[PDB]
Structures are given as structure tokens and as C-alpha cells.
Subunit: 506 residues, 2 copies
């Protein structure tokens, strides 16, 4: 045919790298091939299901686990459709889930059940202690509703306040001082009830977008993948024309500007050079890109500074196997959902995929973020198997306190099988963190320099951090789609660019 031989390089076989390869396989551009290199021995990146055994429900999702049916997520559910993903309902809110703060259980209708307000000798203002949801919907609500109208325009309006942290916004009452002003302890309590420890000190725009996703105006249903999110990776993996090359950690990316041809880019793997690429799509988390030698690409200094400085949140999960689902049978927690607490485990997630089992059951006993995750992570080994006895003992004791209304410590201990697994994303060298969670001013100042193609339009920084949808599959997918667009555009492949718009624009 007409189009000259071209070869592109995809760095990373997570969902964004796999999506790029899937788009290319679909477009069937003549004489175009790709190599996809993955540092880990495992494919999927932050799509990661841990199977204790291959029994139907004997797993937990270490990375992505739940997906809300909202318009901005269409591209995700389209990917689920293309791959035949078996979806089931995910109960964000179930029933009878305990909530434990300051050693008091939540009680419906009671004033200050946790006894943390000034009226009971605490420091939380009485006007705040029981109206956290309402006060935050007043600080976020305008932006959240504009994000439902149209996410891109809603995002642009939110960028007018991006210089503020959530705590800053609440202390001053908006950019003009017109919204309510809150003291420290009121802001602290709103953070304690709404997110993870310290996270109101990150961007206000990120708190708004997380409220938009977890408490969307259209009260959506949630879904998960029966058999684990890694089924998606398997489906995508197997469709590929060129298989993932695992155990291939890219150490350098370069473009030879002394050579005028299309394929003048290289990557270095294990000290060996891989050359002849007309475009390199990097899909790693930014911490991994930060460690590569990128001198050969002549990046803009501020783009380089974004790679180093864009903030990543931590996250840790601990899953315990029990001989029967005691939370279902003894506590009446029959419909998924999650228990929240100021105890170290913070959040205990009841699986939505084993609701009708009666024997061995997995419990996502601890799901943490930020400093909470770093503290649990200090007791965790991501490769290995003393400090994880300490971890197990800690989780069991927190679990007994959290379910004290119906359960004793001895009974939870007796039901425990001795099988557990835990994971801390910051300790994963292939990610270096859990997911982007920008600081104040980062989305409006650093991000646009992150997203500009480099090496004369041949280098793309792709992935969840390269999107407005951090910590969601949708970000990875949009960013991947956008990079393919720029690639086609850059090489003036107008027939295939139109074909992309028809077959792949949602």
C-alpha cells in the first residue's frame, strides 16, 4: 500500500496501553505495527485482581473495583461491552453497615452520636457536627451540577478556583469570601467524615470531582466485574495482534534529531537499544516516567517539573478470608456497602459479589488512602509474606470493635481462616503511588504542560494522570484515545482519523 512502514512504541501494558493497542488493531492501518513493553511480569497495571484460589468468588480487586453509571463513564462501559464483561450490581450503600467514630456507633436521629461537638466537650462546632454532607454540598454543589451539564465546561469553570485547597476554600468561604467560613475543627471533621486523612490539604477541584463521582447528582447505580476487574485485562490482552512483552522495563526514551526519518525514536531496555519508532506512547505513572533518562527528548522544563511534582495519593487494601460470611449471617449486613471509622482500618468494604454464599468468604477488611494508607502500608509486604502478623492482629481487633453490636473478637478470630493478602500501591515500584491527586494550582498550571506532545509531536504522556478523571479507568481511556488522535493528526492520516471519530468517539 501507500502508507510507509511505521512502528510505534507503547510503554506500559495497563489499561491505557492496552486500549491504545486495541484502537490500533481496530483501525488496521496498513504497514503500522507496535511494540508494547511492560516492566512487570504481570499485565494490567492498576487493574489487579488477587485470586486466593480460582474459585468463583475467592478474590479481591487490589486496584479498580467499582464503576458508576454516569454519562462521563460511557467510554468505560463501552469497553466493558466490547469485551463481554459480566457486570453485576455494586452496592456503594448497603444496609446495617456500622459507623464508628470516637468509640461511639452512629445512631439515626441522635444529636452528635459520636459526642465530638463542642456541646459535649469536643471541638467540632455544633452547627457542623451533624450537617457535614449538607455543608459540603453547599461548597461543591454549584460546580458538581455544572459538571453534570457538561464535564469539560464544568471543569473549565472549576479551574477559576483551582489555586485553592479544599481547606482554604472552606476557611475563606470561596474565592470572594462570600460562602460560609469554617474554623479548623469544623474543616477537620468534614474531612474525617468525607475523605481520607489530610486530603483537604490537596486541591479543592479534586475534592469537587470526587464528590461528583461518589455522590453524583443523578444518584447512579454502581457495577463491578464478576470474577474480578482482571477479566478485563485478560480480554484486552488476548485480542492483541502483538502480544505484550513482559519483564521489559524502559529506562530511557530518545529521539535522534540528526536523523530526519519518521522512525527516529528509541527506548533503552536492560541497556539494549530498541529503535525505529515513529511515536512513543508512555503510559506509566509519572513516578516511573520520572526515573527514566529523558534527556534525548528535550522536554520543556515545566513539563519535566510536572512529571516530578504532580502529587500522587497513596492507597492500601487488606483482604481477609473467613470460613463463613459472618457479617452477613450475624450482623445482617446482607447488601454490600461499607463501614467507616476513625480506627486504623478506616473503611471496611463488604463485597457485592459473594452476597449469596454461605461458606468461605473474602472480606475487604481495610481500604485506606493518603496517610492512613501509608500507616497500614508500613505493616505490608507487596512481594513478600512478623509485621503482617501485626497487620492481621490489628485488622481483627479493629473489626471486632467495628462490629461489636453483633460480634465478639473471639468469634471473628475463630471464623478467620489464616489466609489474607494486603497491598500498598506506593510500595509498588511499577507505580510509585496509587493515582494522581493534584495539589492547589496544579491542574490549572502544571497539567497543560504535561499534556502537550513533545519530541516534535511524537512523544505522548498518557494515562489517568494525563486526564481530568484521576483514579478512574475513564481517565486512562480518554487520555489514550486523545493520544491516538494526535498521532494520526501528526502524520496527517486523515482517512484513519475520521475512522477513529466514527468508531471510537463517545
Amino acid at each position: 500500500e501507500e502508507l510507509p512502514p511505521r512502528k510505534v512504541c507503547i510503554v506500559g501494558a495497563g489499561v491505557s496501553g492496552l486500549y491504545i493497542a486495541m484502537i490500533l488493531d481496530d483501525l488496521k492501518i496498513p504497514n503500522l505495527t507496535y511494540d508494547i513493553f511492560e516492566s512487570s511480569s504481570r499485565t494490567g497495571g492498576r487493574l489487579y485482581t488477587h485470586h486466593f484460589t480460582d474459585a468463583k468468588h475467592d478474590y479481591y480487586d487490589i486496584g479498580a473495583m467499582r464503576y458508576p453509571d454516569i454519562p462521563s463513564m460511557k467510554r468505560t462501559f463501552n469497553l466493558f461491552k466490547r469485551t463481554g464483561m459480566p457486570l453485576i450490581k455494586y452496592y456503594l450503600d448497603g444496609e446495617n453497615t456500622p459507623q464508628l467514630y470516637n468509640n461511639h456507633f452512629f445512631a439515626k436521629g441522635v444529636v452528635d452520636p459520636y459526642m465530638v461537638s463542642v456541646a459535649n466537650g469536643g471541638t467540632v462546632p455544633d452547627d457542623v457536627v451533624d450537617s457535614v454532607g449538607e455543608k459540603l454540598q453547599q461548597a461543591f454543589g454549584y460546580y458538581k451540577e455544572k459538571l453534570a451539564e457538561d464535564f469539560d465546561k464544568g471543569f473549565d469553570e472549576l479551574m477559576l478556583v483551582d489555586d485553592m485547597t479544599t481547606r482554604e476554600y472552606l476557611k475563606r468561604g470561596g474565592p470572594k469570601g462570600e460562602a460560609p467560613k469554617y474554623d479548623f475543627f469544623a474543616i477537620q471533621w468534614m474531612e474525617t467524615q468525607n475523605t481520607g486523612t489530610n486530603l483537604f490539604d490537596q486541591a479543592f477541584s479534586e475534592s469537587v470531582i470526587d464528590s461528583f463521582d461518589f455522590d453524583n447528582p443523578t444518584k447512579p447505580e454502581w457495577y463491578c466485574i464478576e470474577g474480578g476487574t482482571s477479566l478485563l485485562v485478560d480480554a484486552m490482552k488476548e485480542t492483541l495482534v502483538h502480544k505484550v512483552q513482559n519483564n521489559k522495563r524502559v529506562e530511557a526514551i530518545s529521539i535522534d534529531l540528526d536523523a530526519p526519518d519518521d522512525g527516529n525514536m528509541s527506548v533503552k531496555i536492560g541497556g539494549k537499544d530498541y529503535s525505529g519508532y515513529s511515536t512513543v506512547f508512555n503510559t506509566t505513572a509519572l513516578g516511573c516516567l520520572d526515573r527514566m533518562d529523558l534527556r534525548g527528548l528535550n522536554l520543556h522544563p515545566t513539563q519535566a517539573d510536572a512529571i516530578r511534582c504532580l502529587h500522587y495519593d497513596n492507597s492500601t487494601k487488606v483482604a481477609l478470608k473467613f470460613s463463613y460470611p459472618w457479617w452477613i449471617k450475624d450482623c445482617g449486613i446482607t447488601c454490600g456497602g461499607a463501614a467507616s471509622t476513625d480506627l486504623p482500618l478506616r473503611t471496611c468494604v463488604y463485597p457485592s459479589y459473594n452476597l449469596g454464599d454461605t461458606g468461605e468468604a473474602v472480606l475487604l477488611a481495610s481500604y485506606t488512602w493518603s496517610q492512613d494508607a501509608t500507616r497500614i502500608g508500613s505493616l505490608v509486604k507487596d512481594a513478600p509474606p512478623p509485621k503482617e502478623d501485626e497487620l492481621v492482629e490489628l485488622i481483627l481487633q479493629n473489626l471486632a470493635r467495628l462490629h461489636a453490636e453483633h460480634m465478639t473478637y473471639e468469634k471473628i478470630k475463630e471464623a478467620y481462616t489464616g489466609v489474607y493478602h494486603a497491598y500498598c500501591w506506593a510500595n509498588d515500584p511499577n507505580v510509585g503511588g496509587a493515582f494522581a491527586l493534584f495539589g492547589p494550582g496544579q491542574f490549572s498550571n502544571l497539567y497543560p504542560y504535561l499534556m502537550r506532545p513533545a519530541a516534535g509531536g511524537k512523544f505522548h504522556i498518557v494515562g489517568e494522570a494525563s486526564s481530568v478523571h484521576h483514579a478512574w479507568i475513564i481517565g486512562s481511556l480518554e487520555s489514550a484515545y486523545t493520544a491516538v488522535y494526535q498521532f494520526l493528526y501528526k502524520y496527517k492520516m486523515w482517512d484513519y482519523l475520521r475512522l477513529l471519530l466514527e468508531r471510537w468517539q463517545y
Copy 2:
């Protein structure tokens, strides 16, 4: 004698716990004993020297390593005197140390050597790019000089602005908007040149106190301990009347309010109860205290919230052994100091304790904080020994770029012995972090509730975080001293309280 038998419990054998025991041994209060329990098999906590071998200079300090001779540090140098510590000069600034940002070496007298300013197509304002030190001394200088006058009063005046982050202070120009206002990229560059990644998003008071310690107005000399900071632990350890009990991890602290006697406090260790304590001094980092069952102490909710929420900074060190000190012989870096860079290693510290050696030499190749430390930490194992090959390769490549003016990669590689060691404090279960580094408003709001004795004046939260001198030995020592004071006071031991003031108040 008159005084009835009493027994106190010291949780943790770091420097604050060891100092408490040393004070008590000195006061020789009749019928008073103590137990000191340490979770680790090793004593010293964040005083931690790693000896590759027992040769005189073949070590690096994983925790504390350097001490500035300033008035607020007197108590530390007094402890050094009491224990016979061999001090030598520590060169904060040495000579010929390279600085590498945006792949350009620093050049004295050049305008924008790193080529990051707007005038060269960057984003750093031209009025900022080369005057970072001056602009920050204008934002900090007033407070730093008042801290030299008198640290306690200087600290109290700094608490009037404690609600602001450093970035907030710089974006608005002080609490009244009277100081200069800086845009994002100017603030970003000040952070890049002055501290670790993202740390201007923490408290402005903490940036001020770090500028006060590392750039004190009285331009002080710095010292380190010849043979490693762990010599201090050995000296303190050996003087104790009651030896540290290692491998004793406290899991719970309680007071039995149904029993009226002095010794009504207990701790739980390995599920066994240890009772009969008239006071418990907890000296652990707060993340460790957060994991204990403290229901038996009826803590104030806001005190509990401080334990969970006070922010900890991360820190990671990597030390490599070389067959000769090539930085001395080939690069003319003969007087210690440190090289700084935007490369992943961030800071390379040249030891001040092997300046005259010519054979095998240790290099502190990487010293990082915050998100920089988490990223290096993801390649590190704190107990164990693939990802640390990646770590070594990364450090060697960064070292070649940083010393490119006098060294090649192959030559640095050839000089490398294959012996290295690395450590990440956030991954240490016995600490859970590196050291306190408070967020906005935390020092002025959460801290005072941290410091109030609990359990009717019998429970003390002691350590560096329980002081105004975070991440310094002086904080631990002051906080320990203060807890002993309150203990004596609480039990009306007036003769021994005066004796404390005579023998131990600096």
C-alpha cells in the same frame, strides 16, 4: 523511706524514652522504678547508624546525622557532653559541589543557568529564578529573627499565621496581603530550590522553622558524631539501671478508674497484661500510638484526632560503598557538603567523616523527603535484600549525570563495590513515617490537645512530634524533660521537682 513504691512505664526506647530513663536514674527517687519496652529488636528508634562493617568510617546514619550549634540546641549538646560523644565538624556547605537542574549545571554569576525562566522559554518569572534565597528570607526573615531572640515567644507570634501553608502565604503575600504576591511557577521554583517536592503545601510555620534551623541567622557550625549517631544510643543504653526490654510491642494502654491507687495503669504486650504503673510515658511516633487500643484511657476526641491526623513527612536514604572516594580525588569535592538536583536522587551528601580516607569510602548517594522519598522508597526493602538492582542502577546513572563535569558513568560504575544499603522511614512499622511535619492550622489547633496529659495526669504523649522542634533530637529531649516535670508535679514531689530544675533545665 517516705515515698511509696511506684513504677512507671516508658513505651519506646528511642532517644526520648532513653532520656526519660536517664533523668530518672539521675534523680534517684526512692522506691521509683521503670520498665522500658521497645517493639523492635534494636534500640534507638530514629537514631540509627548502619555499619556495613565495624571499620572506623564504614557506616551511614539512617536517621539523625547532623547538629547545628545554635542556642535552642543546647540540651542536645549537653546530652552529647554527658555521654562523651566524639564530635567532629559537619560541613553543611562544602566546596565544588555540583548543582543540576533542567540538565544544566549551576554557574556562578550567570543569569538563569538552569534556563528555566520565562526569558528562556520557561515559566519561572525572571524576577524570581535567581533570587529564591532572597525572596524566601523576606517571607521568613521577620519570624526567623524573632525565633533567635527567644524561640518560645517567636513561636507564639508565628502561630498567628499558622492557618496558612507556605504556598498560601506566598500567593497572598502574608495574612494582610501586604507582602509580595507570587504566582504558581514562582512558588514552585522556590520549593524546588529550597525543600522537597510538594512541601510548600504543608504549614508555613514549618517552612519558617526549617529555614531557621538550616539557615540560622547566627551562621552556626554543624557537628556530627564520629562513629555514627548510634554511639549515643549505646552510651545512653548502657547507663540504664533497668535495661531496655526489646521485642516488646505495646498493643494497648489502660487505666482502671475503679481502682483508686497510684499504680492503676496497664499495657498489653503480646496479649499479656503488665500492670501496676503510676504513669505511662508513650514515646512512639504517633502512627504507632494510633494503632494501639487506647479505649482504656478515655482520651479527649480532639487529642485522639491529633494522633490520627498530625501529618508525617517521608524520608529515604541510599548509601553506596566505593573502592575509593572518587568525589574527593577526581571531582575536588574535598570538604563534605551536598549536591542538589531535580534528578530522582535529589540530594547527594558527601560525608564529613571520611575526608582524609583514600580507600573504601561510603557515599550518601541519595537523601530525599516527601514524594521524592516515597518514589525512591518504592524501590527499597527495609528488612529484605530486583527492585534494588533497579535502585542501584538508578542511583549510579543519576550520579554520573550529577558529576559529569569530572566523571563518566563507566568510571563511577567501576569504582562501585556492589555494597549498598537503603532505607525508607515510612515503610518502618515501628515509626510509620520519618517525622512530624504539620499541615496548616495543625500546630495552633491540634497540637495543644496532643500535649495535655490524659488519664488524670498519668498519660503522656512524648517525642519529637510533641514539641516545637520536629525532626530534631532537641524536640524529643525537651518533650521528654517536660513529661518528667509533669510527672513529678502530678505526684507533688517538690524536692525532686526542684532537683530536676537544677540538674536538667537548659
